[PDB]
Design a protein around this ligand. Structure first.
Ligand SMILES: [Mg+2]
Ligand SMILES: [Mg+2]
Ligand SMILES: [Zn+2]
Ligand SMILES: [Zn+2]
Lengths: 295, 294
């Protein structure tokens, strides 16, 4: 209706982690997708992709990772590595008969594609695909919808939690894993357009930004702060999140980098703004950058 | 007295995740300090101390970093265990240390029966003879208690209890593996001076009658170091055998107490694989699987 895509794929990654440490080489350990039929307004739970992934840098899930993701060790020990699962994911898109640029991924934040996908792609030496360099940040739309329908003071602490509390949606909790997030985001997505929300690609991944031209003011305790760690991630990772305002997105933007205006098969090969300033102190090295081979 | 002229105080530190005992512990620091027995002198100038790069879990958990005091950057630029182990062997040869004429001293069975065994499995290196006999200093300390006299101890660790007993200040230089070595060395010296019979009291053996029956499985073993120990005992090929003070003799070096074979033949393969523990795909033993015990 108010969406230029006939199909929306609610995407969700879960990764390895150690809550107390942000200097961590997060590897994908679960890959979950559920399809949403936009014209017919139907969450297609029968149309889904849901695979575990075996990590290779940290092969034993920490206890806090298991508690957070709900993923047992046995499930990843018997899983394929990301390169195999990603290949199965690409075939899945073909099997569904999806065309390039006529569908878009939906996430509850930038984290899934800007950070998790981008970093995992580096580990696996896979080129960042064009359909991961444009997507729908649902929480960003939720922000706009909130000013429009009047704000509330929400008690929830997470993006999905806040959105469910705002629309008074019961928290979906069956599998207690990635697929549950997918289902919650999908239901939120559905309720949002039914409340009259306008859902479209609102974030793009580009190769360059002017705000990265000056060195980051280094915070020594960044490893204990998800917020400050984000600033580090922004400089290390080659592609940056670029907001695109409502009404400005065209389908023909797929798959051309908004900045350099070149195909995403050429753009994204090399880091255009390597943060050398962060890579010169060997008494305080960035572990996740070092092990991924950024320096 | 002690039949060895040189005692080497050994300490291993590993990757870990405290809340989970089903963890494939890898050596990340390798520390040794020498003790000259005839001269009763701790030789800090004679030491081996190197970091080791793990490969199964390359990022130290925060709780491992806090316990071991090892920073991530120190293992990132370190060599793998097989390399460090080769450096260690060359270091022994350079000291002119003749095999069978020195012995390793540890504060417990953990360093050699558990940590060394498992690491050797991962590295695919045969367990050496000088790691299959050693001195468990805590077991000597415990065995000598009635002679030394009773004393209430509030410490919870072996090193802590032994320091507290002898009113020794806790050595805390670098807060790492080497501090354990220095503490154990200092305790060892004190114990010897107080008349303790310091000699080999634990031997690693290929078979044990108490592994003939399958272990009764405790489903919650992963959250308990004690319960997990029972699992380790079955999974690891070599068993701790205890020998009382004054029964050990130097000629025992390099020969298994059970099969009587040389430790070049014995230790090639697990002789009592606990297949009973490996039947449930709904509850696999992760550290056993990833190591290739099944
Ligand atoms: Mg999520
Ligand atoms: Mg120790
Ligand atoms: Zn570009
Ligand atoms: Zn034997």
């Amino acid at each position: 209706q108010h969406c230029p895509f006939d199909t929306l794929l609610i995407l969700d990654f879960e990764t390895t982690s150690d809550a107390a440490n942000q200097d961590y080489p997060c590897e994908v350990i679960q890959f979950a997708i559920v399809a949403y039929d936009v014209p017919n307004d139907k969450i297609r739970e029968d149309i889904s992709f849901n695979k575990y992934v075996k990590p290779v840098l940290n092969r034993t899930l920490t206890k806090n990772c298991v508690d957070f993701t709900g993923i047992p060790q046995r499930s990843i020990d018997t899983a394929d590595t990301f390169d195999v699962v990603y290949e199965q994911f690409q075939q899945w898109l073909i099997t569904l008969g999806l065309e390039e640029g006529k569908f878009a991924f939906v996430c509850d934040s930038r984290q899934d594609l800007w950070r998790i996908a981008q970093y995992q792609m580096k580990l696996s030496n896979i080129q960042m695909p064009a359909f991961f360099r444009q997507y729908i940040n649902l929480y960003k739309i939720f922000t706009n919808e909130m000013d429009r329908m009047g704000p509330k003071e929400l008690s929830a602490t997470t993006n999905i939690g806040k959105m469910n509390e705002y629309y008074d949606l019961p928290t979906i909790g069956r599998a207690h894993d990635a697929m549950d997030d997918c289902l919650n985001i999908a239901t939120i997505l559905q309720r949002m357009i039914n409340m009259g929300a306008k859902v479209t690609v609102n974030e793009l991944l580009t190769c360059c930004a002017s705000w990265r031209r000056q060195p980051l003011v280094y915070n020594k305790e960044w490893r204990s702060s998800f917020m400050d760690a984000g600033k580090i991630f922004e400089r290390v990772l080659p592609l940056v999140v670029t907001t695109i305002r409502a009404g400005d997105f065209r389908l023909e933007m797929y798959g051309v980098c908004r900045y350099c205006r070149k195909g995403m098969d050429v753009c994204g090969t090399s880091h255009q703004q390597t943060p050398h300033d962060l890579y010169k102190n060997e008494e305080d090295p960035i572990h996740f950058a070092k092990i991924a081979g950024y320096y």
